[PDB]
Amino acid sequence: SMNPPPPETSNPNKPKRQTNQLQYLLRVVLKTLWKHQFAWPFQQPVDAVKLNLPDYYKIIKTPMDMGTIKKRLENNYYWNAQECIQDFNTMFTNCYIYNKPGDDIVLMAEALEKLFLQKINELPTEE
Amino acid sequence: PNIINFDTSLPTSHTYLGADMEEFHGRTLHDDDSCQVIPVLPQVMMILIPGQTLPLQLFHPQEVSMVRNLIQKDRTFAVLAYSNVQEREAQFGTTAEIYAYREEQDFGIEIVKVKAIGRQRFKVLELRTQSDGIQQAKVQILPECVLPSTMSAVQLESLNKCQIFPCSYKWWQKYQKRKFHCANLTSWPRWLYSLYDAETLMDRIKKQLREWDENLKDDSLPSNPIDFSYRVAACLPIDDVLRIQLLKIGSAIQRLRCELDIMNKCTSLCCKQCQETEITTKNEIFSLSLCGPMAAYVNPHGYVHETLTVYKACNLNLIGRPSTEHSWFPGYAWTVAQCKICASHIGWKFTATKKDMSPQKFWGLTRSALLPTIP
């Protein structure tokens, strides 16, 4: 049927802060993956209506994309780095789950996940 | 229309494919009518024309291994001209010789970007898919039928000393009157043999092409009728069936005649899916690249689009915001363009980033979405 609402990105009752790990995840990691060649399918939620994928949100119970993560970082939604890392991994895992091994988009997600992981090993300690 | 300060050498370079590729200067050509066993790239769906530059981006491990094997050998693969794309039926094709490659590390996966160029037409004798999943093609090289002058068999010996020649319409009148004199020995006049003369056809094509590209024919256009005909066919925005019929032609004379008939008849370019929605006309065609108005480019996912540059376009909706990422024409931002009626993707609207550029905006329409139409 129709698409669900996208994940929330701002909460006025949620506290905001600027930790060193999250500012690194914003200025380096998400900036590295966002300008990447294969980034565009993950820059926004999956439009299951336009893609004619009626079972996507029946299988993917935890949708996630890089646009949501970007907006969550900019709005200081995260309290810690593990939140954003788990969002990235949820995105990649959803992509692997719904599709099949060897699909073009699976290879693209694998590329972006490899780049994310090699970037994440340089995570700075908090200030 | 307007004027241009764009430098048409940047489109041909395919700068969007990363840094300076490792370029090859060698050339491999197979003898006519000979048979060769050539690998076929799986995801290639284009009807490649000899002389046409083909860019590709491959990230499947099988494709990368095959490209490495080709780089270590003769650097030539087969591009099947599919008559039926769904069932992978191919009777004709064109060879492509890799002249630049680049494997990119510090990338999520191993990806290889390649600039190749079509070389020789061929007939598909046999297609056999190997155990690896990649398929090989036993292939017969189709020769280029170069016919002698139509007056060579009827030429008077005493007039042999007058067949070498030292306001263009008067010059062409004198040319027709001097070259095809012995036509009075046949059942046909001179102006009929002019309709099968390579140079006359080439000059008429040169006019019809001066319409689009302002580059002088003194250097940009070839003198050989075969090379000229292939260059013209590589930039003619026609559908796949017409392109296959044009590829089947072996004689450069027939090729030039068919191309001129297409250029005279075909006037409107409509949506292939709609068949009844005019997108552009022949008059708005203009060349932003050295290769002509239409050239093959590759998107970030290996898909190949034969983009045709036009000044104006009608009956299109614009989807999304402009973007400079992976732009085929540097300094321009593209915007997805769909048909107004069927919403099918027709191409992109390119807009200039600097306010000093010219033209400030144009349309790149993919050939696969267009259909030629005569009123």
Binding site: - | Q155, P189, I253
Partner: protein
């Protein structure tokens, strides 16, 4: 699978070359003439010419020169063919037996090389030191004339000058020297080289390069004591010899382009020159060194392809556009100012551009009426068997098409005449021709051009001539519209109309239009000595061909084939159209089968569906090659002539096995004719239980006429084996393989001849001796008509070949 038989009914009459020398004897003056595949040898007498030997060769004579190397009693003859067969021959006679023995022979064709634009050029060094061949651009082939080179081995020398117009071996040089006119981006120049056999290379010439006229075309090697070379262009005659440079620019030669020359005096004092308009000039050299050059207009002859001075002021003029001539040159001009008096005229049928078959005199006795010649040499020729009686009707203009109308006792002939721009405004003819001297004439009325006219440039005027069949008087001459070219001509009845009409298709040809987009179909009725226009129809293209199709009119307009019905109101009404992938140049018919043909050998076979009122594609073939004429032999066989003087035959399979294969025309017959066929037409010249089925006459460019017929399988097999056995025994002039000569040969492919029986080779069986006949028939038993294997004797095959000869 073809089973066809082609024979020559008239040998080529056109002349492509002529020389004089001492070939039969050192005391005799011999004249040698080349007629494509014929060599004629006469002895020059005080009366005129005495024929001594006519031979045939398995090739097309492209180079014919006489030369006598030091050590021979009389001259030897060098001959190169179109297929690059070179041979040196000697004349031999003992008693009455005359044999043309082959002193040397060989193929000089290179493995690679582009045949040049100026065609094959062949020259011989004066001291008989070498033979220079110019076949491909940038390569000069040298055949050294040693006594050991019986295979005519040769070596190539690189040419920095890639575009050579003409070349000659110079006289009075210590080393064999060539002088040639070439063209480069700087213009046209003359340059000399020396040929080194020791080095097999080029050395600097005796005199340096000079820039010549932009249209310098002819080079003449002037013999001693003069030496040097004369260069002839369109406006100037120059002479070069070391420090000697002498140029003249006589205006009298500016009217037409000189195309041939011949030496009169042995020392090079006088030369004959002939232009394209048939004018004959005398070039006089004034004396150790040259003093001046002079050009005097002697007169007008036939449009000369070659000239040769005999003796006592008698000159032979070999023409391909008209009748050849023997003319006399007098010292004093006549009352009209011409020094030329015609002594004898030899018939030339070439070129035959169209023809038809009519039972003129006796019923059942077929006669062939052909359009021959061009320009002032154009004519009609009436040919009937007696070998062949030929009547000539000169037209003085260029005929193109012809058809017969029995109910009016007259022929319709399409013709064209050349005119030049008037001093004021309009056009003016060069000479009175058939269209300007008719008993009655008319012009068409316009019912449908920027940058008008120019300075005295030629324009074509097209006319339909109604010509009586008994007297051949031009009864009427109807002129067509301005810038209108007449293409097709048909005489027929249509619909329920009992009147017989002359139907003409035309095309509006303008210089800016590369392809005509406007044309007419005009329907005349001839009655009571005046031609009236009955109907006029406008079409959007050129009417390339028309055919009467079951009381209707089938017409080809550019890429379209249309069918018109003749209405009761006497108008042309379209019934159906077929839009083809090619432009329909050739249209032939048989029953409901239509044959559509393109200039590049694109063939299409359609069928008219009467119950549907539309055409249906039956078959097609798309093998590109320059065509020339097409014809339908039967319901399944289609004959055609194409590039490099070849014939082919395609077949269809009506029933067949696969709808994809039912649409293909199989190439089942190939043959190398050696002639450029211009017209096919059914008919025969023999008075009407025969091994052959059908009869198709064809007319060619060199005047040759031939006949093609169909055979059965057993007859074809017997005749093919007869051909093999005859080639095994017959001695060939120049020792040329018959299979090599008849092989379908273009510069892109060479295949053996299939499905064709050389009628001339089989007819030559009756001219050999009885022992050779018994040799050929020996151990035959190739008769598979009864079912088994019947033996054959000499007399059986004698009777067979006699019955085969009785078809033409």
């Amino acid at each position: 699978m073809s089973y066809n038989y082609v024979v020559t009914a008239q040998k080529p009459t056109a002349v492509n070359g002529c020389v004089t020398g001492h070939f039969t004897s050192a005391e005799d003056l011999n004249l040698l003439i080349a007629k494509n595949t014929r060599l004629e040898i006469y002895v020059v007498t005080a009366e005129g010419l005495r024929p001594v030997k006519e031979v045939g060769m398995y090739g097309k004579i492209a180079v014919m020169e006489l030369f006598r190397p030091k050590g021979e009693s009389k001259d030897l003859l060098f001959i190169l063919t179109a297929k690059y067969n070179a041979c040196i021959l000697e004349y031999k006679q003992s008693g009455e037996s005359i044999d043309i023995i082959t002193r040397a022979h060989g193929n000089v064709q290179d493995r690679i090389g582009r045949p040049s634009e100026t065609g094959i050029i062949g020259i011989i060094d004066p001291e008989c030191r070498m033979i220079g061949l110019r076949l491909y651009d940038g390569l000069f082939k040298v055949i050294p004339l040693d006594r050991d080179n019986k295979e005519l081995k040769a070596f190539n020398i690189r040419l920095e000058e890639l575009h050579v117009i003409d070349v000659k071996f110079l006289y009075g040089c210590q080393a064999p020297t060539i002088c040639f006119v070439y063209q480069d981006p700087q213009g046209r120049h003359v340059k000399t080289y020396e040929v080194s056999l020791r080095e097999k290379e080029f050395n600097k010439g005796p005199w340096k390069q000079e820039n010549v006229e932009a249209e310098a075309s002819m080079v003449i090697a002037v013999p001693e004591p003069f030496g040097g070379a004369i260069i002839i262009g369109q406006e100037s005659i120059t002479y070069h010899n070391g420090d000697k440079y002498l140029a003249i620019a006589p205006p009298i030669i500016k009217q037409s382009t000189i195309v041939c020359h011949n030496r009169v005096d042995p020392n090079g004092s006088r030369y004959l020159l002939g232009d394209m308009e048939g004018r004959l000039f005398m070039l006089l050299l004034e004396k150790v060194t040259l003093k001046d050059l002079r050009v005097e207009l002697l007169g007008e002859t036939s449009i000369a392809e070659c000239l040769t001075y005999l003796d006592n002021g008698v000159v032979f003029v070999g023409s391909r556009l008209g009748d050849s001539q023997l003319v006399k040159l007098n010292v004093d001009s006549n009352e009209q100012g011409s020094y030329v008096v015609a002594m004898e005229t030899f018939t030339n049928l070439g070129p035959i551009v169209d023809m038809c078959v009519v039972d003129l005199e006796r019923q059942g006795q077929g006669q062939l009426v052909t359009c021959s010649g061009a320009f002032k040499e154009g004519s009609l020729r009436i040919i009937r068997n007696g070998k062949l009686h030929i009547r000539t009707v000169p037209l003085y203009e260029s005929p193109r098409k012809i058809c017969y109308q029995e109910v009016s006792q007259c022929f319709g002939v399409l013709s064209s005449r050349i005119e030049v721009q008037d001093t004021s405004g309009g056009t003016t003819a060069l000479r009175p021709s058939a269209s300007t001297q008719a008993l009655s004439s008319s012009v068409s009325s316009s019912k449908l051009a920027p940058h008008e006219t120019s300075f005295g440039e030629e324009v074509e005027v097209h006319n339909l001539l109604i010509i009586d069949q008994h007297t051949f008087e031009v009864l009427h001459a109807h002129q067509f519209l301005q810038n209108e070219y007449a293409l097709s001509l048909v005489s027929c009845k249509l619909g329920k109309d009992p009147n017989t009409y002359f139907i003409v298709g035309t095309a509006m040809v303008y210089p800016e239009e590369a392809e005509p987009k406007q044309g007419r179909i005009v329907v005349f009725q001839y009655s009571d000595g005046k031609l009236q226009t009955v109907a006029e129809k406008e079409v959007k293209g050129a009417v390339y061909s028309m055919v009467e199709f079951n009381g209707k009119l089938l017409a080809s307009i550019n890429s379209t084939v249309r069918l018109y019905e003749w209405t009761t109101e006497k108008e042309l009404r379209t019934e159906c159209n077929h839009y083809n992938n090619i432009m329909a140049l050739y249209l032939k018919t048989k029953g409901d089968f239509i044959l559509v043909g393109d200039l590049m050998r694109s063939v299409l076979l359609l069928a008219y569906k009467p119950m549907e009122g539309n055409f249906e594609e039956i078959a097609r073939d798309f093998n590109p090659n320059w065509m020339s004429a097409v014809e339908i032999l039967d319901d399944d066989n289609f004959l055609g002539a194409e590039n490099a003087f070849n014939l082919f035959v395609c077949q269809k399979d009506s029933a067949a096995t696969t709808d994809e294969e039912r649409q293909h025309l199989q190439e089942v017959g190939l043959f190398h004719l050696g002639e450029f066929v211009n017209v096919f037409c059914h008919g025969s010249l023999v008075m009407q239980s025969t091994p052959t089925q059908g009869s198709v006459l064809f007319g060619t460019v060199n005047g040759m006429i031939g006949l093609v017929t169909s055979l059965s399988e057993s007859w074809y097999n017997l005749l093919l084996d007869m051909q093999n056995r005859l080639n095994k025994v017959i001695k060939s002039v120049g020792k040329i393989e018959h299979s090599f000569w008849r092989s379908f040969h273009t510069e892109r492919k060479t295949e053996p001849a299939t499905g064709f029986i050389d009628g001339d080779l089989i007819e030559s069986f009756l001219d050999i001796s009885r022992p050779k006949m018994q040799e050929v028939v020996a151990n035959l038993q190739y008769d598979d008509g009864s079912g088994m294997k019947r033996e054959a004797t000499a007399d059986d095959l004698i009777k067979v070949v006699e019955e085969l000869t009785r078809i033409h």
